Structure formats: structure tokens, C-alpha cells
Symmetry: none
Amino acid sequence: KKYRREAYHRVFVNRSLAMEKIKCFGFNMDYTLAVYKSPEYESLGFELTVERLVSIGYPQELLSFAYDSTFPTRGLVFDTLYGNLLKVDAYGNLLVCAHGFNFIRGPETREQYPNKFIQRDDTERFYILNTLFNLPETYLLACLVDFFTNCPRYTSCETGFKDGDLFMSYRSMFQDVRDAVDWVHYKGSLKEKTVENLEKYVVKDGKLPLLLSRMKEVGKVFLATNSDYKYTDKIMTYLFDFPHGPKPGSSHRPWQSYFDLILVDARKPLFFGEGTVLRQVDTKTGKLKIGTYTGPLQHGIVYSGGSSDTICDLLGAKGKDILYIGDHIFGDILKSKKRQGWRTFLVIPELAQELHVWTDKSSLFEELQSLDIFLAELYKHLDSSSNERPDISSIQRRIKKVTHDMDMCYGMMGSLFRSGSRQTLFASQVMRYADLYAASFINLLYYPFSYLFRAAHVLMPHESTVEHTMESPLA
Amino acid sequence: KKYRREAYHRVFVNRSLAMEKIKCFGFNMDYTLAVYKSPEYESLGFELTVERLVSIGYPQELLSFAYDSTFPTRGLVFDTLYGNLLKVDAYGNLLVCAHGFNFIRGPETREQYPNKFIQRDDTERFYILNTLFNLPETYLLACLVDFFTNCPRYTSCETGFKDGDLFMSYRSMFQDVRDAVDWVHYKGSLKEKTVENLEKYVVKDGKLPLLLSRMKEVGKVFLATNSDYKYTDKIMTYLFDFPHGPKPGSSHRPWQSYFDLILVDARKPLFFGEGTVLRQVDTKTGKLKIGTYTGPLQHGIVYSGGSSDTICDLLGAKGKDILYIGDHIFGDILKSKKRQGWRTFLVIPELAQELHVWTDKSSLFEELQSLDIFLAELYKHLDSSSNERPDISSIQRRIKKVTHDMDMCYGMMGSLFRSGSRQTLFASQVMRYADLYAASFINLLYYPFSYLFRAAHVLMPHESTVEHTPLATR
Amino acid sequence: KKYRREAYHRVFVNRSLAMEKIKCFGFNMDYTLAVYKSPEYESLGFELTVERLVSIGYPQELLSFAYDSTFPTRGLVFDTLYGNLLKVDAYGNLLVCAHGFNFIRGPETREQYPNKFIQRDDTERFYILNTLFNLPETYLLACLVDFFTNCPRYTSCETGFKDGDLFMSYRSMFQDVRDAVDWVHYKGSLKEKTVENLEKYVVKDGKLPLLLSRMKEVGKVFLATNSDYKYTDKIMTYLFDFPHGPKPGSSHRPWQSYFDLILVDARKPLFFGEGTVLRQVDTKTGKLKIGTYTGPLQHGIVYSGGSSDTICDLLGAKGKDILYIGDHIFGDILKSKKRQGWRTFLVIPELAQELHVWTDKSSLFEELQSLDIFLAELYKHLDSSSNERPDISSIQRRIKKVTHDMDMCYGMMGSLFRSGSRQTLFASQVMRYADLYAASFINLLYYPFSYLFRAAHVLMPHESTVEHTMESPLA
Amino acid sequence: KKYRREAYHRVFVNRSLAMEKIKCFGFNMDYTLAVYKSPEYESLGFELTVERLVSIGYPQELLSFAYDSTFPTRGLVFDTLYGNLLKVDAYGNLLVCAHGFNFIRGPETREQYPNKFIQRDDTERFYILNTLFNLPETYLLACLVDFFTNCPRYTSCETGFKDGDLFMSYRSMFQDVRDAVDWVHYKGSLKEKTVENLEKYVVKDGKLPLLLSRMKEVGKVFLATNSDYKYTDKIMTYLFDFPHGPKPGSSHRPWQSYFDLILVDARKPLFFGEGTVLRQVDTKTGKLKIGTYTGPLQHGIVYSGGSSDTICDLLGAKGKDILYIGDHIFGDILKSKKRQGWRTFLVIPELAQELHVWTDKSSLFEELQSLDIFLAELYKHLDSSSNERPDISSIQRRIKKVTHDMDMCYGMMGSLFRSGSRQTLFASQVMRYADLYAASFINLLYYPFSYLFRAAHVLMPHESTVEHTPLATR
Ligand SMILES: [Mg+2]
Ligand SMILES: [Mg+2]
Ligand SMILES: [Mg+2]
Ligand SMILES: [Mg+2]
């Protein structure tokens, strides 16, 4: 039995990585350093989207919607043609299909998805609700479908609803939701009401300055956020407001002092390709300077826009010397660039409450391995030369009821990573994108900066189920 | 603790499937029912390929190439620009790079692959050697690159070789190979020289009729082959040449009696699309009837062309009622069609010899496992508080040396499924396409037709490494 | 001698077009139906951009800039690396190169453009000021380069200016201008001050309702603008405010009655590809309805967003039955679409004042054809067997001075279509994009709707200079 | 009213150029100094190409193809997907579409080209037959398409032809043609069979030495050829075989005496890039010296490889001081390099025979011109006020019939420069690349080296159709 950190502190390794060769730690801000509290933050976002939808003309019944965190799972696929929330596997196959709040079973899925299959490439048809900000709109969409479906004033249709002489399609409707969320995030009052009560909305943890401290003793540390500087200063100042610096008794110091480079208005994902013009920010006003200091790496400066390359020049680093910590899954379309890629630490908040299910619901996992063992015993001496057709309909039904019992410990749309046997599309892009992942980057605090992160083998069927311990010539 | 059949007998399960709901069993012919022997069939293909390249104008020194089955591994990617054979992962990442027979260590790869990544979505540059018929040209490609790179009279360049004034691009060369193979399969003598010594080139097992007789007992059985009839009828005849039928003591019967439906000239994968026009075959002349028997089905008939939907109408079955046994992996583009798709049994010959390494080298698997444990012990009481660098350099080189030895027990280009901690593009295409897999379809013989095939869970780093026993919690 | 309409009324034909086969006339609004008066509109745009640049920190001397229409020619290329306005030919060759207000001659161009050549594909380096709205920023850029170049406070550099410890590059500076223009057009007060005094800014012509009238007697007529509906209603109402309808004595009627389809918020050029969702507009509020009427072509409706295809369905038309009148040159990247392309009428306002030069400055054209004739006479009997090297330096100098005398009748950056011998890049895309062109679409008023628009041959050197009236076997 | 030389003697001017500033004259060899005779050299190439395709495996009926110089026109685009030869305009637009020898009228083109447009920026689909060496395969391509489409034993498809079971894509076929040509030029017998009857295949004119002797008098003259030396030295020798030197009565002298610099094996267009390594050639053995004479220049030397910049250093001249005479059009990608580029003289053989139509068919040009006038008269007093449809249908069909007759005076695929009111992709590539053009470089003989070459204005619809005599004015 090999030693492993306690489960809640671990950094999970998809591809091996020698920490010693890391010269730079980069940081996302939103949902990486600034972990927005849950359900509270989603409920805020949700409410501001409903109100904005009502002001543009939506029916007042929407004001009755209250966000329910137990419904959405991140990563779902909205089908703007059929108004369905879909949980797909890595290869496009349906796992969960719910219309509004109505969960469709296998046989009925074949009416609209005759081969239980969607074409995820059809960017026109489907929208992947991949991001922690997409959480409220995921519930909102089910709500609106559930509402209009059950409200007498409207007639339900394959692709939407009839409202007298009018027709709101699930696709027209989805765009309203999408635009409203954009409006809430940009011209709206989300960042306003967030800053006006940070205790309510943003987690504060005092190990965060400690961790960034030791990072800077052994490497360079930078920040590259998409939010403007006025919003960053407010959120970063609160994350560092303690009556002491990194360790207690020591003097507090500004948050800018924990970074060798600070960049705002990055404009990710375009940041990683050509970029934008590299600007510098007057920190007094939070407004761009007209000129821009170009030269060596001196501090006090806050850069705006730019590109991933620009960061690499200023820090004096090759790509693979940069570990980049964040909450987003940047597509494999930037990996193509002949530039050296950044290493990756992906933050997946869900991980915490799912590692809980995994350790506290062990009774259900055991009941599954029992029926599985028992089922293999009923066939132990059966082959193609066997008449016998055992009765396994009730034990097949029990396996059906216990995985669903297990599926529901995660939420109404199940685990983020799997549904029963199959891995979800989301876990597929986690494995493709992320060298390292965990629930918070703060888990880096429990590993020496000399650590060797040796990845685990993702075993194939013939690899997990046969141990290392005359043949037909067809083999 | 649970029961599993002998490792070499097992059908391995990717997605679950209940056999009692299987009503039709369909069969590929080449490399499925007719397992071609190895290395002999590769060598014959390789030698007819080289003859053809020499017939076209290539230097005589090629006649001295002989196949070496220990080099090639299925699934490699030839970079026509820089003339390399690559082993890529599922997401485009270089695992192994060899120019000719010269293996390129990580640092060097950064010259041509600065980011150790290829856009496998670039068919004008890369050609994925996916098929069992691609092993010879995988090696032939490496032979030629090594030859033209070490032959005194040719000069090496980034993208090909100078023959004096004249310049041959690895891409131009690859087309010559790629067409020479096409020629050997389609216009040359391969199919001909195979029939004339079938006992050298084709495996024969009496378990095959036995297994197909028990299928016809509980369902309909069909054959959907890309080969023509003159060839199919020769190869199948041999496969059924025993002085007895299915069980021993029993009168032998014709191979055609084992299939409720026989279709040749399928033009798969166009078969699964619009297809071609359904044609009936004159069993005698080995050629086409002017008409076709549409409507109902009756035995004695041999179809040509058609589509996968034609088979579903004639067999009277829905898509998921069909289990299709074969050796090719048809991409995800044929699933999209609003038809109900077939359940799949993929045949992976390599599996037999790869299941030997996994069991007969349990000494390297256990050495690596001990090295990992010892590594965990050296960092047990370390965190970001401590700033000590334990010396892992000895441990590390030993790891890299044992996994390369484990890698070489598979062959010169590693295991068909993985290279180290990383899965190949092949393995990922296998788990995308295949419901069930095994070294031969014959393994179905060891299972009842009432069997419940329950998928193996493909665990994640945070599921395989943790027991069931506020910046994160939000 | 063939008959031709008087020069100011003509529609110029690049590719032949049978008007009889046109079932639909489509319309741009901004700078097509709403011709913004010049210099007045450019001066407005220019002033609002300067003020916005000053509020973000530009030096107050800018408030002294006054727009001068005699400087810019549409279609120039800004080089964000060297801060130069460039007038290029179809193939990338320099014609005019001015830095600020300083016009560089041949030999000095080879310092920065050693082969008198730019790579127009380098979208990062160069910006093509192709559009009638880009006019103010074209002068503004020369101004800012001229300013900072000559102001003691700044030091001039190859790629910008030093301002103490700072460095404003011509590329950083260009982005400020570009963003400011965007700001003026969108969140700014351009559309506000335009609507608040339409007599000042938008031409009113009473033949415009007459022309749209006869169009609708013989075909369907539609409008597809990028401006929102509140702005369209204001501009279209003024264009149609006369105390009478199409012909005088007749009753005035609304502008919406001149159209079979009205579409706003098109989002060209994306309009011509996949598009956006097709919405419908509540004309009372100028705000989108929640649902959208789908069905046959009934009137009173005003559609929003959509796609070129959507228009084709509703009008019942194939692509080549649609003549589309506008002021923009849509790239050849939408021509690719397997969709049938629209026919094109390109509006080029400049055409009016340039056809003026062509007819009023005939004395200069004649002086050129004289020196040209005279020059060919000095060589009449000269061949490779000739010692004689005539003296043509003063007549070469006169040709240099008269084309420049001619070049300047167009403006400080010369004609829009040519500079001396060479055609400009702009005329190249005019010929590629436009089936028909003229100074206003209103010239359609002088052609019957049965007219055959037979295009003119663009003659090659060996075609214009040899008439229809023993050889070396090398030919 | 102004003076112009005889139409067949003229250098035509695209951009202006003053000859007295020309210090170096450079020469291409094949199709420039060595004008290959027509149709004979096309036929020889065509026949060796077909022999090679039959040697490889193509049906014997090909041996009955014979070249027809009246079909092909340079600049056509072969669509490998649908097997068509296309004549496109400058912006990608179909002017003429022929499948085999079947010409496709507008309406039919809309099946395969719904928008009568091709993305010529798609080299995997289209191949632009730009060069004088491409005429044979232009016709060969059409021959094969027509053959396989009308041969009883082959079946036609959208994208190729079935040979029974086996399927050949027009794209696969095109590679066979394209390489068979490559073979004939590079490994076969073309260069060989040309030397053995030079008086059949290569034009000879005594004006050539005369013209090159007057260049060496007022500037430096060099030769930069892609051919090797054994070939260049054979072809040039013949070009200078007269019982006298430049003027008559004067001692003949060697061809090498006419060039201050001779460079073979140029590998143009890589020549204009980084290039290859500069090599000296042993004049005797026809092979390479182990060294190279770097530094200064002296006569007697023959260079190999190098780059365009090497020539500028050795000749001691800047780019715009060089006028480069040749028959190829090197794309806009070589101009971008921050070097000073060469002034260009493009040689367009076709020009001679096309300047005959323009002058000897002045009857159709005048009929069309009258039809246009009459058309203008029928709409003179019409505006959008009048709603009368005059009958133009008679006039219109006559126009379409006379321009097709004017089109056919050029050949079966129209004029090399235009089709009707529209310029070809060829013409636009000519006015992009070429400073001066003419049917042969020989025409320079008819001009002083002090001459001012003044560009012809390429007028626009609003410049050619209007004399110098408020919705628009803003
Ligand atoms: Mg984020
Ligand atoms: Mg097969
Ligand atoms: Mg406009
Ligand atoms: Mg040549």
C-alpha cells in the first residue's frame, strides 16, 4: 500500500510533471483565486438574469423562480431545437435527457434522438454550458422550458411555443437568456452587488497568501485575469485583507507585492493567440495610460491586454516552465500554435463535494460490487454450449435502482464526471486539457516544490480486469 | 474476488450489452473470419509491394528488404512533410518519433515538432496507418527513409532526398508506396498468390463452424464483406474444409449454409451511407445477374452492393438488434445518420500477444510498482513548508529504463494501446467505436448467448487513487 | 459614336446584367439611402473622436484639430509599425507614402519599404481605411502623427514616441483612435447629434421615393441595415418627409410602405453567412418582441437579425434575382458559400466629384497626351541599332509636374481609383465586388427596368494600343 | 495619332521602365532563348507521356491519342474532384467548363458549381495548368476523361470511374498524369529525344546573337536557367550555330562568350529565396568541381545553384537595375522578401497568334461594335418612367453567336487572356508580375536601349466610357 495525502488535500495527476522544473506560476482570478461562494453567487447571478429578462418583456411569473443548486450539473448541452438539457458522453451519446424538469427515459429519447446521439460539432444547434458562470442559466433554461410548457396561455410545439399569432422557439428563447446573462455580467449590476458585500459572495482563506508566498521564494508568480483593473483591485484586496501578512505576526502587505507580473484585460482565449496591444494601467484611476513602459521586469507596473508570448518575454521563461492555474478548459485549438504550451492546473470546485460522495456513500459502492460479483457467479460455468438462461431481471433491476440511488447523491443531473459506466464529455476535456487538477489550487500547499507528480494510468478494459498473475490460432 | 474466464478466452466489454437482445450476428470476412497468418501474409504483401515499386522505377537495393514483424505497430502516423513515423496520443501528442529506423529522443523532436504536437486533423500532411493491411507499408516507409538517408548516391533534406539534380519529397514517395500497395491489393497478385497456398496464409479452426452453428440456432447470421465472390467463395470454402460439419461426426456442409444472408462487394464504409445498388450474384459464373431478387428473403441467394439499411430490411431487424463483428474501426461520421446503428465487436489480433506481456512480464510491472511506492515514501512528510530536494535521480533513471524495457516487450514501436502513462490514438479510437473487443471473435464461443456483458469502468485519477473510506467547498 | 446618358446620371457596368431578370432590390441604409452630407458629417465624427481621445488622456492641443476634407482619400493603409498612411496598388506596391503631413518621395521610401512593397495580408501590421466612416480617422491619424512628431515634449522614434519613461507606439496609438471611433459610433453621441439636426447632416432628395416607387411596381423591394430600429425610423422618416408621396399632388405615405421586407440589426457581414436568430421588432417601442411571427409575407412586420437566406425565403427569390444596393465592399470570402450570390450595385460617393475633374480638367489630360505623342516621335526611327540617346529630361520633368498637377485636383492623397498609371487597391476591389456602380443608387432613375447593362472590356496593354486595322520564328 | 511600331514587333508595357537604367539583362533558357517549336514539342511530350502512362498500366487505347493543339489553352484549372477543366476569371469565377471534350453550358454548371465559383486557393482540389510545359497534360487530362467516360468497360461517377469493382478517382488519375509528365521531363527520354533532332524541336534565329551582342555592349548579360549544363550547352550551341557571329561576315563565337555570367541548376523559384549552395561546373566533364570560385568574377566560369542575391553580388548590381527575361510567372510571395526585386520581361508565345485574331478578324470586332450601338439606340429615350420592353432577343442571340465565333478564332478553350467581357486568371497574373511582355524577348531588338517604356493605362468603366468634355454630391 502506497502513501497518499489525505483525500481532501490531494492534487490529482493526469500527466506527469516535475515541479522542480517550474519557474513560473500563473493565475486566473475569477473562480481560481476568487472562489465565489455557492449557492449564494449563483443565486445572485440567477436573480439578476430573471429581472433583466422581465424588463425586456418576459412574463412576471419568472420573478417566482428561485435558484435551486440541486438541479444543474456543469457541462450540459442545451439543444436549441428541442429545448432539452443533455448530459452527453465523450463521443456524443446521450446519458441524461431532461425537458424542463421532466427526465426522459431511454425509449422516449429515440423519438427526438433516434440513435441516442447528438453532433456536438453542430455549434448552431447545441450550446455547451461548460463554465462555472453558466450554472445559473442551466437552471434558468429548465425553468423557462418547464414554465412555458405548463402555462395555459402557451401551446407547446416541437421547437417552441405558440403565443397567439407569435412563435417563441427554444432557440429564440435561448438567445434571450444568453444575451441577458451577458448583460448581467457586463453592463449589468453583478460586479456591483458582488463588491458591495464581499463577505457574502467570495471565500476568504488565509492560506492563500502563504501559498503565493512560497511560490515566489522558488519561482516567478504572475496573474492574468480577464476582469478590468477596478474590479481586480477590489476582489484581490479583500482576498488579502487579514491583520497580518503571509504568516501570522508578520506585517500585512499589498496583494500586488505577491506578483512579479500583473495583467488585466487579457482577453482570453485570444490572449493565447495573437493577443491585443500590450497596455499599462495607471493604478490610481484604473484607466489606461496613453503610453506604455517597455523594458526590463520592474515592479509597481500593471499591464493590460497583451498576449501569452508577451508574458513569456517579460518573465524570461519557456512555455513548459510555466504552470498555469485556472478554472477554464481552453480548447485544443490553441495547443496547435507552434509556441511552447503552458502546463496546466485546472480548478474544479465540484471535486470537493464529489470526493465526499465517494467516501461517505461507500455502502452503495459495495452493494454494486456485490451484485456484480453475484451476477458473474450465475454464469461461472456457462458458455455458448449452454441452454440455461438464468433469471436476472430482479438483480438487473436492483443494479438499476442503486446506481440511480448513487447518481442522485451528486445532484439531479448526476456526477460531473460520469453517469453510470460512461465518462461524461466534461471529464473527457478535463483529461485532455489538464496536467494537474483539484478542487482548489490551494491544495498545492501540501506538496513540496521538489515534488514529482507521477500520473496514473487510465486503464483499458483488458487492462483493469486481467491480473499480471492450446490457444485457437484465430488469436 | 469475482469470477472471470481465462484471460485468453475473454470478451472485453467497453459499453454494456445483453446478448439475448442480439438477433443478428454480422461478419466481416478479411482479418475477421479469415485470420491471415503472421508474419507470412505481411511478408508476401511486403514483397509484392517492393516488386511493384521496383517495377515502377525504384532502386534495385529494395529487393534486399525483408519484412521484420518486430518493428511496426498499428496506428502510427506518417508525417509526409518530414518523413517520420509517429506514435501520437489521443489528443495529438508525440509519444514516439522515428525517422527511418532512427528513434528521436524528446529534445530532438522539438526541432520538427516544437510543441510535440501534430494536427492529426490534417490529412494532406499525415496519414494514419490504422489497418491490418498497413503493417507492411509502415515498415516499407521506414525502410525507404533509412535507405535513401544512408545510400551514398542520395543526399538528405528536411523534406525528402536529392537524387543528383532531381528531388523526391517524402510526400511524393509516400504516394508511390501508398499506390503500390493499392496496386498489389487491387491489380497485382496478392489475392492470387493467397489462394494458391491457402494453408500457408489463412488460419483454420474447427471451432469456427461450431460457433457459427450455435449463432444460427438463436438468431440470424449474415456476412457483409468488401471482397468479391470468386475470392470470398475460395477463402470460405477453405475455412470450412474439415471432414465433418460443426460438431464432429456430423456431415460437413457448405459454408453458404451457415449464413441467412451473404453480401459481397460491400464498399464499406459507403455501405453504411447511401451505399451502392443492390445486385444479385450468379453463384455459378462468379459474376452478376442482370436482375436482383427484391422483396422477401430466401436462401440460396448471394447479394452484392446495397447498403446497411438494405440488410436491416431483408433481415427484418432494427440497428441495436445487430452485433457486427469485424476488424475495422469506422469513424464517428457514420453514427450521426438518423438511422439506428449497429452494435460492434472489434477484432484486435495484436491482443493475443499483448496479453502475454501483461501476464508473462509481471516482474517489470512489480518492479515499477515498487519504485513508485519508494518514491511516495521519500516525499511522505514533505509539503510546501519544507524546502529539501531529495535525490530521486537514481530512482528516476531506473524507472525510465524499466518502462522502456516494458515498452520493448511489445516490439520496436511499443504497445498498440499505450506508451507509458499515456493512451495511444489507437486505444481511444477503440473505446470510441467498439462495444466489445477481443483477439478473435472466436472468444464468443466461451460465453452463453444469454450473457450480460457489463462494461469495465474507466476510472479517473481521483477515482482510482482514493478509497471509499472552504476554497474547495465554497 | 454610341449613345450614352449624360455623364452625371450614368450607371457604370463592370459585369453585364439584365435588369429584366431582377425580382428584388435590396438596400443598405447608412451611406446608401441616408447619404450623410460632406464635409459636415465627417467633421462631426472627427470632433467627437478628438473629444473622446482627450477624456481618456490625450494632450489638449488636439482640441485645435479641425477636420480638413482636402486631405484624406478613402481606402488608405495605415502602417501601425511606422505610422505611415499608404496608398497602395492592387498588388501591394506603394504609390503615395505620407508620414503625418509629410509626403515622402521615392528614394526615401526605400529606407522603410526597401522594395516599395507592403504585405496587405499582414492584418496585424496594416489597417485598410476602406469605409466612408473611416474618413475622419484617416485625417485624425495624420494629425496625431504630425502633432507628436513636432511637439517638443516628445521624442520621435522608428515605431513611436518617447514621453519620459513611457513609449507610445504608432500601434498603441492607432488602437486608441480605433477604439474611440467605435465608442463614438456606439456608446457615444454621434447618432444623438445626427438625429438632433437632420437638415445639417443627411441629404434629402425627393426622387428617392419616386425611384423606390417604380422599383416596387416591377419587383419586390427590401431594406437590410445594420443600425437598430430606433435609429432607422428617425433617419428613414426624414428621408421621406415631403408634403407629398412619390409624385407630387399624391398623398404622402410612410416609409415602411415602400418596402416588402424591412430588416434591422442585420449584423453584416455575418448576416451573409450563418446569421443570427431572426427576431421581430415591436415598432411602437423599438424593442424586440419575445416571440416572432413566422409565416407568409404579410406587411407591417419589421424583422431583426436573421440571415441573407432568411430574406431569400421570405421574398421567394433565388440569389441572382436580387440586386443589392449598398456602399460596402464585402470580401470574396462570402462569395465562396455554395449559396447563390446576390448581384451588386456599389455606391461610391467620391464618383461625383471625380467625374468633375475628368470633364473640367480636360486641358491637363490633353497636355499629357501631347507630351506622350511627342515622346514617341523622338524615337520613331530608333532601335537597338541606335547610338542616339535623345534628351528627354525636361519633358520627363513636365510629365512629372502635370500628372501631379492632375493628381491634386482630386485631393491631397489623389484620386480614389488611380495614382498616375497604376490602379489603386480600392479600384481593384470595386471591380471584383461590384456588378454595377455609380455615385448614388438614385441614378437607377434614368434607366428603364428593361435595360441591358452590357459591361465594358477592361483592355490589356496589347489590346488598347494595337488597332484591328517575314516574322521571326521566336514568335 | 501617335507613333507605334509594327504590332508584331512591339514590347507591350504594363508598368513604366526606362531602359537606360537597365544595367543587367538576365535570361531564362527553356521557352525563352530556346523557343520550342509547336505543335511538335507538345506532341513529343504528349506521346512520351502516354507511353509512360501505358508503361505503368493504363489501357492500350491511349496509344491512339494524338495531340490536337487546337484544344488546350494555358491557364486552365483542373478540378480533381469532378474531373473538369475550367477557365476561371481573376476572382475565381467560371467562364468555361468542359468535362472531357464536353462543354458545359451555364445552367448545367450550376449542378457542380452552384455559384459558378471555385476557391482557387484550394490546392488539394484544383491544379492550375500555368506553364508552357502543361499544354500536353491539359489535353491528356481531357482525353482520359472523355475516354473513361465513353469506353464501354468503364462506368462513370461524379468523382471518377469504376473499372468493374475497382474505383479510380479523377484525383488519383490526375496524380498519375502529373507524375508521368514529371517522369518524362526528369527520368524519361524527352531531353534526350530533343537533342537528337534539334532542328525539329527548337527554333533558330540569327537575330538572337545580334540582339545579345548589343546588350553586352551597354550592360552585363547573364543566363539563369533551371536546366543542367550538358543540356544547356547542347541547346545553346545549336541556337548559335550559324556560319558567322552576331552581324554577318563576322567570325562566329561560342555561346558562352555572350554572357558575363552563366548559371545552371538554378532551382527557381527557391533560387529567389535562400536558394542552394553555389557550385562551379567543370566545363569539360559536364559535372561539378569540388570547389567554387568565390569572391570576384572572371569569365570562363559556369556557376550552379546559388541564389538571386548571389547573382546581384557577383554582377555588382541592385535589383531594379536588372531586367529578367523569361516565360514563367513567379507568384507574389517572392516580392515580399526585403530584397530589391528584379524588373521583369514576360515572354508569351501565344501572343503572336493572338495578335493575328485581333487584326485579321476586324470584321467580327466591328459587327459586335455595331450591335452594341444599335442596342444603345433602342434604349436612348427610355428611363425608369417608361415601362416598355423592346425586343432585344434577336440582337442578343446574334451577339452571343458572334462572340463565340470570336472566341473560337483563338481555339477550343478561348483566348489566353479573356473570355468575353471578362479577363482570365492568366491575364491578371500577367499584369501582376510582368513589367513588359511580348511574344518573344526578340522584340527588344526593335527598340533603343535609351527607350522610355510608358505604361498603358488600364481604364475603368467610368474612365473609358466618359469623354473629357445632391444624393451624389453630398
Ligand atoms: Mg474564470
Ligand atoms: Mg476486414
Ligand atoms: Mg453603410
Ligand atoms: Mg522557362
